[PDB]
Design a protein around this ligand. Structure first.
Ligand code: TTP
Ligand SMILES: OC[C@H]1O[C@@](CO)(O[C@H]2O[C@H](CO)[C@@H](O)[C@H](O)[C@H]2O)[C@@H](O)[C@@H]1O
Length: 579
DNA sequence: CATGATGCT
DNA sequence: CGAGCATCATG
């Protein structure tokens, strides 16, 4: 039983200076999506409004946009962006229950009010799936059922704010919410709604050229196999490789024969079909994901793509990007990297500006490990891969080969992920004995890294969780498991999550500090994309010289560690050219 | 919906 | 038997 007014006009008592507010968008992708209902709960009552009415009401719209009128919400960014598509500004969000729940425990996967409510045993609200249905059954119910659901969501947010802020304070996460995550949500909403302009003619032309070149490679594969088959089917490719061609079976997957990139590398000495298959797959990814996917989702009249940054998903505090994912555009191979030529500035006489932290996770490892050898390399800006090579191969600087540096780089990032000697041997295609020596030599060279790995596992066992620089937490109950595989994966999380997560906290703080400085100076430059350790902007060409100073300095100053942060930056006419 | 491939940080 | 992700075609 919950009393509410199904209102047919806006009243002053709905425009209080503290309220919980629901602006319901049912479509998972909320860009230009319908708003299906509005609810407001405040000290005066509980109200459902039809959006045709509220959003055409001058005083409701002014209330939405008034910073001083404070709103508690769940997934404020989804409402902010859906309102921006309706030309309505939402301001004054002072509590976001989605981000509060995420900070309390990202492993709960909270993605609706009822899941956040479960954290406090609050039962007076149903799950969105119970009301809307799943999958093909998804639908807005009849008004009275809809209005009840949205009012119970707003009433849950109203009641839950205090309990969640108190727990956040106990976990030292109250500033993490209010000074970091909530202001970042507003920034992301602006980046998503601005979108990134795409040169669809270039994409369509690359799609033409790739369709030709896939057909060439496909045919050569069939020639070498002496049979036509589905190169993307594991069953069919495994029959050709391992039964027709009689190659050795190096690894199995749960359902058959592995054809992983590392397996295929090991098979390449046996048959020329193996290099061709690796090539086809690379081309197939460019066509199926990047070319065909971007062209599907670009808005044709503006040529913009509008991704969604999920702020409340990863276990370490990173963002993720979806529909489309703009954080995995190709770079490594030149064929794919040219996709970046299609990412252009949204106005004439504008340029793309890309700035990236240089080796942030290795700098963070040096800070948190307090390892004297490591921190000195960064404090003196010495090439850390060369430094590691000189240690794992034991040679002077001049004796380090191109190949030695490659191996030492693999060791340096491997350590950050908890690599075993087995993994290092597979990655490098070298003797496991040798791999083990490399790791042993690393820990002898960087003994504070070894101490940190022992100490953080112990801390996880004693406290039940590990933390990052700005006090994000990840719980690791498997750290005590009797199963070797389960325990070992938890220990690698304990080692890695403070690294990866503290790097995520640093670039999020940079984004907030950068947006402040751009606004201070009244620059037209603004953020387009974040790619984990990089920020991509666009700006009038005339703003370039200012951004060359301002962007790296804000990024580098975002926090102060036991080593410097270092930012590299590039600009040009397309994202490809910003190298 | 699951699988195992690809892409990025 | 190296951390965190999204996407695709196929099963
Ligand atoms: C190899 C590797 C790179 N990266 C990321 C970090 C960098 O932002 C990005 C590009 O890596 P690189 O530029 O290849 O690495 P680096 O900056 O250490 O190398 P170099 O000294 O040779 O210039 O990829 C990972 O996150 N994990 C990895 O295992
Ligand atoms: O709105 C982003 C925000 O919503 C959640 C659900 O609370 O995720 C939904 O929307 C995403 C963006 O389209 C989808 O990818 C996802 O499938 C859907 O559940 C939160 O996870 C997210 O932070």
């Amino acid at each position: 039983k919950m009393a509410f007014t199904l209102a047919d006009r806006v009243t002053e008592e709905m425009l209080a200076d503290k309220a919980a507010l629901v602006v319901e968008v049912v479509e998972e992708n909320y860009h230009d999506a319908p708003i299906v209902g509005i609810a407001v709960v405040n000290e005066h009552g509980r109200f459902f409004l039809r959006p045709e009415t509220a959003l055409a009401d001058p005083q409701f719209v002014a209330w939405l946009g008034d910073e001083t009128k404070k709103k508690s919400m769940f997934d404020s960014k989804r409402a902010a962006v859906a309102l921006k598509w309706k030309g309505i500004e939402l301001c004054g969000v002072s509590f976001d229950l989605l981000l509060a729940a995420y900070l309390l425990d990202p492993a709960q996967g909270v993605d609706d009010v009822a899941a956040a409510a479960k954290m406090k045993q609050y039962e007076a609200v149903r799950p969105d799936e119970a009301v809307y249905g799943k999958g093909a059954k998804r639908a807005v119910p009849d008004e009275p059922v809809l209005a009840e659901h949205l009012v119970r969501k707003a009433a849950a947010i109203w009641e839950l704010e205090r309990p969640f802020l108190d727990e956040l304070r106990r976990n030292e996460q109250d500033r993490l919410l209010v000074e970091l995550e909530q202001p970042l949500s507003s920034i992301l909403a602006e980046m998503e709604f601005a979108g990134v302009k795409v040169d669809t003619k270039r994409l369509e032309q690359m799609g033409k050229e790739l369709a030709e070149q896939l057909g060439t490679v496909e045919q050569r594969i069939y020639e070498l196999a002496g049979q036509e088959f589905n190169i993307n089917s594991p069953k069919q490719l495994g029959v050709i490789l391992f039964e027709k061609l009689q190659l050795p079976v190096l690894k199995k997957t749960k359902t058959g024969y592995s054809t992983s990139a590392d397996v295929l590398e090991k098979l390449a000495p046996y048959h020329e079909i193996v290099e061709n298959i690796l090539h086809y797959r690379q081309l197939g990814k460019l066509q199926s994901t990047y070319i065909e996917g971007l062209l599907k989702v670009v808005r044709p009249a503006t040529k913009k793509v509008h991704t969604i940054f999920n702020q409340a998903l990863t276990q370490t505090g990173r963002l993720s990007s979806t529909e489309p994912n703009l954080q995995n555009i190709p770079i490594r191979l030149e064929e794919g990297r040219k996709i970046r030529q299609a990412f252009v500035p949204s106005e004439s006489d504008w340029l793309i500006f890309a700035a990236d932290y240089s080796q942030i996770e290795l700098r963070v490892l040096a800070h948190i490990a307090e390892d004297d050898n490591l921190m000195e390399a960064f404090r003196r800006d010495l090439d850390i891969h060369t430094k590691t090579a000189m240690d794992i191969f034991q040679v002077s600087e001049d004796e380090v080969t191109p190949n030695m540096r490659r191996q030492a780089k693999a060791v340096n990032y491997g350590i950050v992920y908890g690599i075993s000697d087995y993994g290092l041997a597979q990655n490098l295609n070298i003797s496991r004995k040798e791999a083990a020596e490399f790791i042993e030599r690393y820990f002898e060279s960087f003994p504070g890294v070894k101490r940190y790995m022992e100490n953080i596992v112990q801390e996880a066992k004693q406290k039940g969780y590990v933390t990052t620089l700005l006090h994000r937490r990840r719980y690791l109950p498997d750290i005590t498991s009797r199963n070797f595989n389960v325990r070992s994966f938890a220990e690698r999380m304990a080692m890695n999550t403070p690294i990866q997560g503290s790097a995520a906290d640093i670039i999020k703080k940079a984004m907030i500090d950068l947006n402040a400085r751009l606004k201070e100076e009244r620059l037209q430059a603004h953020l387009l994309l974040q790619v984990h350790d990089e920020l991509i902007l666009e700006a009038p060409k005339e703003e370039m010289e200012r951004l060359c100073r301002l962007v790296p300095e804000v990024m580098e100053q975002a926090v102060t560690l036991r080593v410097p942060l270092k930012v590299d930056y590039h600009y040009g006419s397309t994202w490809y050219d910003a190298k």
